[PDB]
Amino acid sequence: VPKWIQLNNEIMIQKDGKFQFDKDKEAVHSYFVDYINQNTVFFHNLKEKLDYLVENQYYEEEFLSLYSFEDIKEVFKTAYAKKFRFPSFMSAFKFYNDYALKTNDKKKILERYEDRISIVALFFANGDTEKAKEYVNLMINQEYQPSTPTFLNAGRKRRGELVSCFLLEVNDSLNDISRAIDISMQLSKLGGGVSLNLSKLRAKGEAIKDVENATKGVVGVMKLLDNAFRYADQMGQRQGSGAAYLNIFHRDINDFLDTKKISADEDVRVKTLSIGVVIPDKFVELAREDKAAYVFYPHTIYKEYGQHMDEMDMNEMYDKFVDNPRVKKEKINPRKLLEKLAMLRSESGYPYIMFQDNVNKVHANNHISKVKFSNLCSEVLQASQVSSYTDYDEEDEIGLDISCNLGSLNILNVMEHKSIEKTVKLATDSLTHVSETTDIRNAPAVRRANKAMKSIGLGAMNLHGYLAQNGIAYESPEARDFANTFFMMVNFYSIQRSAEIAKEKGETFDQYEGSTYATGEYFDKYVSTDFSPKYEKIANLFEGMHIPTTEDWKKLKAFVAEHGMYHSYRLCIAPTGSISYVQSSTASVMPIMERIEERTYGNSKTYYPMPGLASNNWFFYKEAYDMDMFKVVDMIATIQQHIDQGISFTLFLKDTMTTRDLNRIDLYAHHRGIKTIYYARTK
Amino acid sequence: VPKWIQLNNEIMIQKDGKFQFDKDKEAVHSYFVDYINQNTVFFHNLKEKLDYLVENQYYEEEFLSLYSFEDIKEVFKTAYAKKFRFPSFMSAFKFYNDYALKTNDKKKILERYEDRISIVALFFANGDTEKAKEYVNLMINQEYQPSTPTFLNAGRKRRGELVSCFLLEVNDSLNDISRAIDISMQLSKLGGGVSLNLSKLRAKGEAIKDVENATKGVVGVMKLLDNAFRYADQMGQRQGSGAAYLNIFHRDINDFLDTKKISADEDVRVKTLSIGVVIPDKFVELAREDKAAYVFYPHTIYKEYGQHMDEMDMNEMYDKFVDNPRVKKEKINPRKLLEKLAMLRSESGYPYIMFQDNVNKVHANNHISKVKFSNLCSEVLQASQVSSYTDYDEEDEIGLDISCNLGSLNILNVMEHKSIEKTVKLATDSLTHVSETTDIRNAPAVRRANKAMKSIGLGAMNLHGYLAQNGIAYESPEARDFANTFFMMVNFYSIQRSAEIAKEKGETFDQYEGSTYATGEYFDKYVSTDFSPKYEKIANLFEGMHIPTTEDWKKLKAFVAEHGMYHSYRLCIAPTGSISYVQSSTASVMPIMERIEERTYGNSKTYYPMPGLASNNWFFYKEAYDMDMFKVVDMIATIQQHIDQGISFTLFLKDTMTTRDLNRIDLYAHHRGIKTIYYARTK
Amino acid sequence: KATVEPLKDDDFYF
Amino acid sequence: KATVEPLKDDDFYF
Numbered sequence A, B: 001v002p003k004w005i006q007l008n009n010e011i012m013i014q015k016d017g018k019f020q021f022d023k024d025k026e027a028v029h030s031y032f033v034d035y036i037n038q039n040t041v042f043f044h045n046l047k048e049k050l051d052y053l054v055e056n057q058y059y060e061e062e063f064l065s066l067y068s069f070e071d072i073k074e075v076f077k078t079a080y081a082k083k084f085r086f087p088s089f090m091s092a093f094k095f096y097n098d099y100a101l102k103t104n105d106k107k108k109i110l111e112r113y114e115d116r117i118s119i120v121a122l123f124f125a126n127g128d129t130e131k132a133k134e135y136v137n138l139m140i141n142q143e144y145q146p147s148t149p150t151f152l153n154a155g156r157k158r159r160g161e162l163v164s165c166f167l168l169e170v171n172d173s174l175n176d177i178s179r180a181i182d183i184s185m186q187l188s189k190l191g192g193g194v195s196l197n198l199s200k201l202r203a204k205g206e207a208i209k210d211v212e213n214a215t216k217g218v219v220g221v222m223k224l225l226d227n228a229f230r231y232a233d234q235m236g237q238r239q240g241s242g243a244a245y246l247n248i249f250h251r252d253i254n255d256f257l258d259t260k261k262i263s264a265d266e267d268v269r270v271k272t273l274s275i276g277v278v279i280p281d282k283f284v285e286l287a288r289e290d291k292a293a294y295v296f297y298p299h300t301i302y303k304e305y306g307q308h309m310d311e312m313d314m315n316e317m318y319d320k321f322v323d324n325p326r327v328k329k330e331k332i333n334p335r336k337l338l339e340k341l342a343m344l345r346s347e348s349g350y351p352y353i354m355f356q357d358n359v360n361k362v363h364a365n366n367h368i369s370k371v372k373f374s375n376l377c378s379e380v381l382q383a384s385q386v387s388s389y390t391d392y393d394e395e396d397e398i399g400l401d402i403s404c405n406l407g408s409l410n411i412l413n414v415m416e417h418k419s420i421e422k423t424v425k426l427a428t429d430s431l432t433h434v435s436e437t438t439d440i441r442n443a444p445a446v447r448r449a450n451k452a453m454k455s456i457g458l459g460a461m462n463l464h465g466y467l468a469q470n471g472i473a474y475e476s477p478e479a480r481d482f483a484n485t486f487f488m489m490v491n492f493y494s495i496q497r498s499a500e501i502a503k504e505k506g507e508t509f510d511q512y513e514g515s516t517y518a519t520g521e522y523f524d525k526y527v528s529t530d531f532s533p534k535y536e537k538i539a540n541l542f543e544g545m546h547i548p549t550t551e552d553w554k555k556l557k558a559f560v561a562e563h564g565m566y567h568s569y570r571l572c573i574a575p576t577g578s579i580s581y582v583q584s585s586t587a588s589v590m591p592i593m594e595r596i597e598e599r600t601y602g603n604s605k606t607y608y609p610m611p612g613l614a615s616n617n618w619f620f621y622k623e624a625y626d627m628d629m630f631k632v633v634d635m636i637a638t639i640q641q642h643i644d645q646g647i648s649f650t651l652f653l654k655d656t657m658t659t660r661d662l663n664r665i666d667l668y669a670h671h672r673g674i675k676t677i678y679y680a681r682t683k
Numbered sequence C, D: 001k002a003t004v005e006p007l008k009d010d011d012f013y014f
């Protein structure tokens, strides 16, 4: 066993009844003085390194050609001047195993952390040396972290796409279904997770040109998509991951759910395609009143009204659907469907739950379209217009397929540096650059939506780490007050940066004029309610930083009205799975699953303590499963009130609790304004 | 139990030690006295019937509008003047259960046999009343039978395409694979059987964008195609049928074959995807000499030579591939592979066998392309060019995808009427009309090849029936002499009609000038070898009909040289599954499987004796399984020497014979010039 | 397989 | 499954 592995395992060997956390630090030293420094490839100077990486097809020469070599040297020197040290063995291990650039045979390390950060910063700046240095200081301080696609692939010749998630709308036609399969394979080839809205597809037993009981429903398309994602599996490196979203009022909703039952037959079971359920407020109202509900056949509704079932408001059209004899429907028990959802989530963590009305009551771009589904991580909530893919030799009507670039603020590092504004603006600029340089030649709706919406996702990580390292319980009202203030600041500065970009470029996102940003409605709660901390401890935490007041929000509203906004969507809190290790941060705004996690790599086992875990903050690092899910819902709703898109909200459940407890948590989340629920992980 | 069913089951009841065959005739009467006439919709006049069928979206207005009502009435009167009577119960049952037009509620019969024949004739003639009457006389004499798609759908508004055999070339790209899946779905939606060539696809463990061991091989594409064919199943009417063809020198050939093993796992086996193997002469030579063969990785060959492995002659390329270090390959035992093919055919009848050099040594259009694969029934053998389907908003390079037009001569009815020439020419005209009226807007290469090649397939059936009713054993040399003469006349008149159509329209098929028809090579064996019958009995059978001599063939060769040929391909012998029942004929040129076949419809049993079966010809109606497969191969080769495309050749094996016997039959078929082997049906 | 417990109403109100 | 015999060199000639 390696020396650093032994040093890392020495953490759990208690000395005087206490964990040896400091041993972890020793491990990193070993991991660098025995493996990383020996396996790294050193050159005489930076010029030889850059030339070797350029000619050997490791780096794209275009982004490096925008800078003179003196500027690149200055950027690299700025990166290395911080003398960044990984505080834990797992941070360095995760970076150098998942994100550091290696040779073709993967026998040596070509990129250090500073080298990777410098390359990403140079790609972000697009020829601006000072902006490149700003990005270097932002990332080496670990205030901001580009998503895994962006961080891993920026400036690389053999790179994939920098966009993490893609959302596709599938129209009710064989041509559209085949095009959706093709686009899903193309985007999984690019490495991104693909989510498809199957609510427009007509249910099983519908008519295909006057011959009835002919359609296979959404389950056949689900099987096709599952096979497509199995085939396109990132060249066999990462398993192809897809998501299917269906409205709960679709007739196939049961069969949909039956795809995830552990007793499902092979002709129905789907195993590589995640499932999500979109629940309007009408379904929750029907379940609450115990009135038997009706699931609908989408094609009959489309024939009668000319619009898809998910294209209009069910809260106002459900009674018309039920009373219309030309609309076909089936009777269901909404409470039984809710119990089935809870049972399925207990068994397998599926489906994702999207509370459609919670998303669309604060959605700023309802004029473009209502949010009808979410992404594979159930945090992207954007307007999408379905595409009309016609026959060959016929022009296709290209709609809008959602796609946003992810980037997470490290809350602990951002607040320690007292740089919410600067970090938010620089992250917004980097995400705008990632969107601008993204061009997908096989997904037309994705390309058009990227060009028009200009949507970005600016997330946050290390919420629980910051709270525990500052002596604040994650479930405490003080933690929710901190989240309220911090994310109001993040939203304020993201809106300010979006408006500044719109002013400097003279262009807003498409159809901005009909948005609530243009009408000033979006700023209502910000121009009447003060989001400054209500607790003295939180206010002290925010000292040295100008917390925006109602007057600052009014000025920002006037600025947006004058100049507009460049981005339709700005903030989305992704799970941030593996890149949180490199940043020494807790995953997303979720509470920690465990204080020390035991992970098996190769034939060895390693223990990763939570960042900053110690004796004095052991009980502040409360495990998520031991927490009250209602208070976690309260925290997520408090954050969500300042996030325009959704938050990947994973439920952490105990084995003792029943499906009724899961249903109660889901209904409280819906009551509190939670937009989406990601996973039901049971301990 | 209905009266006609009792009268049909009375056949097996033996009187005086003989089957009551004549009772079947009585059954037909009952089937018309009790059921057909009662449930047949009658109108006061044909005008009312046509108006009701057109208005209720049963027929098409366009083809009926080309004639005055007097001409349509005259065509119907010509059809009804024959007073055609079905000789067996199963003929009428199959027609009125599969082909007769029924109401939307499927309880009444709108079309009789004469009505359907008149409608198909009017569709064929395209406005010529005399031509329509000629077609009506052709089909009511049952000399020619349009295929199930043409016969069932001609003149019907609610219909699929008139072509059901489609051959697709799949290029080695994700765009091309997705387009192939889409086109397969669209053509299965039209009701057609789709065959895909997978030899150009790179094998498992090949490189995608210079990353190693990334390709899933052809088995993943087969899984995708199998899911696509399961999804597209004629609006839930018939099981989606597809075929995949792989060259035996393709690296995946074993895994390909492993998709049909019973022991194969769920992620390996494809259930609704037929498989065929293309066997070049090089593989047979390697197996014969017991030299170990090599299966090559197609992408390495493409990178080294710039052409696909299946696009070059393996006979001259195999040594260069083996000696090339940059071409990747694995060692295999060709005899072990042949034994595996025989074992798989014994287990399930798969794969289809295509002898590439047997097809291409007589292929007239090798300049366009060599025949690389066959159809789902393994009888369509045509030149195909792969298409380069690029990314979106980029122009595709449309190639040639095979789609030939099926139609079968009834050898018994044709020869008893002494009308080989007239029937062949009228069938060629009808096939040309159906090919010209076919327009598929979702298969670009299929449409382009239909417009350019103008390929049709004119088949034959009732060969064994005709031989048995004339006191000729199917395995006798007299039967082969008759087949030689009859199919040489069929080829002569098909070529004459093609040249006449080319002269009339002033156009030939695309790239005809490079064909062996233009150079006169095709007629070589016809201008030197006399194909007149060598037996007096066969000559007396051909009495009253002019048998083309060598001088007639020289005149036809000169005529083709002067005027060209309209069809790239003219003759292909399809299995003729259900139309053989309606025509009271034995299926294809195959020998009969059973003298009397027992079938179960609903909860009732039915008995179909072979047409013309009696005590006198009971011995001549020898069952296929009891026959020597070498003599069946000899007869099929005798026919194949006059057929430009292939013949659906099913092997009929006993359970006693081993895989060595199957391999011997396959090798004798290869030796005798058999182009394709369809199925290995074990009794 | 978590214990299936029916929704008892008043679980929709908070 | 069906009985399996190996292919002899004489089965390749007719």
Ligand SMILES: Nc1ncnc2c1ncn2[C@@H]1O[C@H](COP(=O)(O)OP(=O)(O)OP(=O)(O)O)[C@@H](O)[C@H]1O
Binding pocket: A028, A029, A032, A033, A037, A084, A085, A086, A087, A092
């Ligand atoms: N935790 C760590 N994170 C990142 N790099 C590290 C870490 N530990 C060691 N290294 C790398 O290995 C080298 C070993 O040097 P070490 O940290 O032991 O101190 P040093 O030789 O006194 O110099 P310096 O600390 O100034 O780099 C470091 O210079 C650095 O490049």
Ligand SMILES: Nc1ncnc2c1ncn2[C@@H]1O[C@H](COP(=O)(O)OP(=O)(O)OP(=O)(O)O)[C@@H](O)[C@H]1O
Binding pocket: B028, B029, B032, B033, B037, B084, B085, B086, B087, B092
């Ligand atoms: N074997 C058969 N094949 C086809 N149709 C038949 C057959 N037997 C009876 N029919 C149908 O039933 C009708 C009655 O025929 P039947 O044998 O009673 O005498 P017919 O002289 O042919 O009668 P009709 O006055 O109807 O011409 C036929 O006209 C025909 O429509």
Ligand SMILES: Cc1cn([C@H]2C[C@H](O)[C@@H](COP(=O)(O)OP(=O)(O)OP(=O)(O)O)O2)c(=O)[nH]c1=O
Binding pocket: A189, A231, A232, A233, A234, A235, B171, B172, B173, B174, B175, B177, B201, B202, B207, B208, B209, B210, B214, B215, B216, B217, B220
């Ligand atoms: C994308 C993808 C392709 N393939 C197969 C199918 C294709 O025939 C082959 C790659 O075809 P292409 O998609 O054309 O590969 P490429 O153009 O990206 O790179 P290159 O042309 O240099 O190979 O690999 C997979 O098996 N899995 C996959 O996920």
Ligand SMILES: Cc1cn([C@H]2C[C@H](O)[C@@H](COP(=O)(O)OP(=O)(O)OP(=O)(O)O)O2)c(=O)[nH]c1=O
Binding pocket: A171, A172, A173, A174, A175, A177, A201, A202, A207, A208, A209, A210, A214, A215, A216, A217, A220, B189, B231, B232, B233, B234, B235, B236
């Ligand atoms: C062709 C086909 C369609 N379908 C379903 C899936 C599609 O969402 C739906 C629409 O198919 P379409 O492609 O729209 O079929 P169509 O346009 O010919 O019929 P219509 O005019 O009624 O739209 O039919 C199947 O389930 N199986 C099939 O084989």
Ligand SMILES: Nc1nc2c(ncn2[C@@H]2O[C@H](COP(=O)(O)OP(=O)(O)O)[C@@H](O)[C@H]2O)c(=O)[nH]1
Binding pocket: A041, A042, A043, A044, A045, A046, A047, A049, A073, A076, A077, A080, A115
């Ligand atoms: N020398 C060297 N520097 C590197 C390499 N990779 C990254 N760097 C960094 O890039 C910057 C360039 O410095 P360098 O050219 O080596 O300075 P010089 O030695 O005075 O020429 C330094 O701050 C290094 O930390 C490498 O392979 N070799």
Ligand SMILES: Nc1nc2c(ncn2[C@@H]2O[C@H](COP(=O)(O)OP(=O)(O)O)[C@@H](O)[C@H]2O)c(=O)[nH]1
Binding pocket: B041, B042, B043, B044, B045, B046, B047, B049, B073, B076, B077, B080, B115
């Ligand atoms: N009357 C009638 N004739 C039909 C029908 N279907 C096909 N036919 C045929 O179409 C032809 C039309 O002739 P018809 O209108 O009956 O003129 P008629 O013989 O003087 O009474 C006839 O020869 C019929 O055999 C039908 O439903 N009604």
Ligand SMILES: [Mg+2]
Binding pocket: A172, A173, A174
């Ligand atoms: Mg449609």
Ligand SMILES: [Mg+2]
Binding pocket: B172, B173, B174
């Ligand atoms: Mg390619």
